[PDB]
């Protein structure tokens, strides 16, 4: 059988192991009601399109047991079929007691029977539309249903692992309400703290009250969602062990409102510590970002971006401004990203992403991965070895530079393919039409050669090491992959060279040696 | 064999015989990192559409010998195929010691070798980017490499002489350094200048210093990069004797500013007297002419057009503007012309040239060669003869007017179809979408007859001689050239002549008779 996937860390870098070597995620979702079989002719256009080697699929417990207990995996069984026809791997997004937030993706015997799966009760009496986390109900019967889906898929895919990850609900957490204020809920945050908890956040013992103080309510939802989808995600990797993991309803990563107008108890940045804590089970927490501000953006990969978390942007925007993240993503070590919304079912998810998802948005995103896809082992590895950085252009169009031993490395945006990036006489090109869209990633394959890929950026090398040394770029091969083996395609000289490394919008790939003379 | 092609002067006039006869260069350079057999593919469509009759190609030192005395003339040889099959010419461009000033092109073995291979010392004491032409070490490996290359060129093209002029080094010279300050250098500058020198340029004998007093250092620099060359050039000719020119990065024709901030060195318009006195084996001096302005385009086609310097613009701009400047070349005796960056490999060298090469661009410069490749054998001839008069749209529009014995030719900018020169009412058609895009040449074959052509221009002819008789065009003859021989087609009268000729978009050949009466 293929080697299970597995999410590695190694020095507080991060891999998911597929076939046995690292494997980047250049992902894509569908919308959310498109994972039936009278949808696929209108969703494998756009995934083929777009050059996704990895597709999210939501696998709904409504759809598998319909009725308690009468399983249904036949969409799945042809899902797999389909996408191996197309050579993609996938990732099942399980869709159970949590889909943004709400139950509403359960099976009717579970939703309308509130009696036997209750929802939390708000601080006024009044139920939520939100399931309560507390429920040993709710949870022996969401856990039996993500088994069962386990064990089929160990039936029908140990042998390729098509699959590669398994999301386990989808962004968890209430609006509305910070806990569950019940009866038997408060008999529980009147009582101890979890010790296990207590230590994880460098609290003081206590009851809920005593040791988290105005953190209290937010991190006993937490706590509790947490344990709820650890319990899930232990009973299914007990027969199936793929890498699981959660995504999350963000807050803003700058000026964060109060937990009851964002999805409390979902793995918002401040309660990553507490999710980690509750769910060991879980591999790594995901963020969603539809924040299409530069400064945002960066801003919620650095929180999610740890030694102890793998960044995966498992939701993005589809509006073409998005397209350039991926750069910004795997230039800070992350193993997957992916934009949500491509098919052609004539969904659109503005004002979060594109209003009408046609070939002509698709191909905004195809171009990136275009160019990815057939590097996307190379990257792996060598991000997974520490030598990658990279960036998106920012709003602004400022410069990012960095130094990667002796030499620093720098993305410019605007520029032509030829003058001097200090000509100041030469304006710059001007804005994208659909906003900012360059981009670029650099290996340090050792101390004097790199890799280096973009696109609508320059790419320019100095020498950090303040030593006096002039330097030249000695050689600029570009090359590409066929079967994951570099060909010599020519080497870059004269003007191409002379103004450091402009990107396009088609697909260029160098191999660049630094000397000094 | 085919005979050797020769750069000939005949009473101040030039040609380039290829075949026993003189031939016209309409010729168009690739990009710089454009000569090798993965992109040939995007070259050769760009070429077949521009009609270009000749190619310029890099011939690299790091291509040709990437390790010492290991010559490998693998792409030459597929080019020279190629070549063949597409029946055009090549002149082959020597990029070794000098590439736009810089050791770039030199492969590692000698420009990561500078205690072997020296770069110049600057007047600060500290070492510039750019090759000492005082050292013999540079010399002899650089002529080593150019004589392997003209004798494989011998053994695979003397039978057909695809290859018709080779380029020696490119736009040699120094930016930021007007010499070698180094103690070698100062050794020899403290010294005598040379005989030859001194009576070149009509100074007096004493050293460097004495001699040329405030343009010594230029003068010094100029002098031995023209040496360096001048020997690299002999040694391929005393294998293979092709003609072989120079090129130069130009300083202003106008308002030139101090040397240290051009190409101090390389063939710019004060040191043409040194290049000739310097470099006996080379033919000519060619301009790079990168200004879109007529005023400084004509200025630049007067210094490098003399009675001992055949006029060939090697290199000029690819925006559209640049199209009608074929016209003022031809016009002015030139052998050739062309356009730098003709193909489809991504690459615009804006604010030079285009910023995109697609096949509209390239139509653009296309028209001109379409009309003027099927008659360049006999404007060549014609043009050595001293027959040949033209002209390209000014950039205000004004006439332009000449004497040819007893008449006057005019070339008119902006006029329609129909209507005399002299309708103050009628409005001019407005300005080019990409330019100013109009310009004549007219050749006369005897005293009476003339050969006229010409894109969005009206020729008008008069009486120049001042004896009162009336004139008329008595016959106006369009036809065309097949197998270099004229066909008739038509006669133009009435409307067509009525309003001089009016020349469209488009090819039309005339060959007009006139008289008085």
Known sequence: DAAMPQLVTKD???????????????????????????????VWPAIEKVGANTVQVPIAWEQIEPVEGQFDFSYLDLLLEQARERKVRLVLLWFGTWKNSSPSYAPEWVKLDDKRFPRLIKDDGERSYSMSPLAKSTLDADRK?????????????????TVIMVQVENETGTY??????????????????????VKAVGAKPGTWSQAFGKDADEFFHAWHIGRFVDQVAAGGKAVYPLPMYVNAALRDPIKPG?????????????????WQAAAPSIDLIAPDIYMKESVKYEAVLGHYARPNNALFV?????????????????????????????DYTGYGN??????????????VFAANYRLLAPMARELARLSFEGKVWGGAEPDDRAAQTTTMGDWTVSLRYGKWQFGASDWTWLKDRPPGPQGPEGGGLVAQLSPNEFLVTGRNVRVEF????????????????????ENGQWVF????????????????????????????Y
């Open 12 to 42: 507080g870098r991060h891999a998911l192991m597929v076939d046995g070597a690292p494997f980047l995620m250049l992902a894509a979702q569908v919308n959310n009601s498109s994972a039936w079989p009278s949808q696929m002719a209108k």
């Open 462 to 481: 100095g020498r950090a090491t303040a030593d006096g040394k002039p330097m030249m770029m000695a050689r600029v091969e570009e090359g590409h992959f």
């Open 145 to 161: 249903a993500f088994v069962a889906l386990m064990t089929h898929l160990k039936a029908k895919d140990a042998a390729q692992k």
């Open 350 to 363: 503005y004002p979060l992403g594109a209003a009408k998802v046609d070939e002509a948005l698709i191909e």
């Open 258 to 274: 109060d937990p009851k107008t964002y999805s409390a108890g979902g793995p918002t940045d401040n309660v990553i510590g507490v």
């Open 314 to 342: 498992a939701e993005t925007g589809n509006d073409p401004a998005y397209a350039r993240y991926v750069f910004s993503t795997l230039g800070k070590q992350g193993i997957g990203w992916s934009p949500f919304g491509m």
């Open 489 to 516: 395609d020519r080497l870059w000289n004269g003007d191409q060279t002379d103004y450091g490394l402009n990107f396009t919008g088609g697909s260029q790939i160098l191999r660049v040696k630094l000397a000094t």
């Open 176 to 197: 509305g309400s910070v806990r569950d204020f019940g009866p038997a809920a408060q008999k529980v945050f009147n009582g101890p703290a979890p010790a296990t908890l």
